[PDB]
Amino acid sequence: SRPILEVPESVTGPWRGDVNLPCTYDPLQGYTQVLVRWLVQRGSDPVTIFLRDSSGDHIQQARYQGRLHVSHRVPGDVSLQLSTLEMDDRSHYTCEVTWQTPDGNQVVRDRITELRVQK
Numbered sequence: 001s002r003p004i005l006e007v008p009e010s011v012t013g014p015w016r017g018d019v020n021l022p023c024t025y026d027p028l029q030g031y032t033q034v035l036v037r038w039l040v041q042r043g044s045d046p047v048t049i050f051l052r053d054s055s056g057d058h059i060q061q062a063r064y065q066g067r068l069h070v071s072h073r074v075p076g077d078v079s080l081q082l083s084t085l086e087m088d089d090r091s092h093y094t095c096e097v098t099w100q101t102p103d104g105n106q107v108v109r110d111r112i113t114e115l116r117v118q119k
Contacts, residue, residue, distance in 0.1 A: 002031075003031055004025055005023060005024075005025050005097060005110070006023070006024050006025060007111035007113050009113060010115075011113055013082070013116070013117055014118055014119075015086075015118060017083075017085055018082065019115065020079050020081050021093055021095070023077075023080065023097075023111070024077045024078070024079065025109075033097060033099055034053065034100045035051070035053050036053075036095075036096070036097055037050065038070065038094065038096070040093050040094075041092040041093070041094075042091065049064050052070060067083045068083075086117070089117055092114050094111070094112050097109055097110075
């Protein structure tokens with residue numbers, strides 16, 4: 001049918017350690033991945049923390065540049081890796097993927113996960 005994102009409802013990571021927030025899908029013929037975004041919930045509009053598009057990976061905030069990476073090697077795996085976890089990294093995160101079909105249409109799917117940080 002259409003691509004199905006798989007994102008666990010919650011993940012727990014170690015304080016000062018590293019965690020992977022899984023976000024994966026099985027690739028489907030005729031669906032080309034054109035955008036990945038990861039967002040975090042803070043105030044009154046989701047914060048964009050990562051984008052991958054035709055020009056590469058974009059991590060605009062100094063607080064994340066150097067401690068945020070997104071999986072790339074296996075098609076369909078766009079999991080977020082966050083290193084040196086802070087207690088205020090506890091939040092809800094959105095994984096959002098956009099695909100383009102041969103007719104030129106684009107379809108967007110997203111899922112939210114909760115990261116808990118454990119001492």
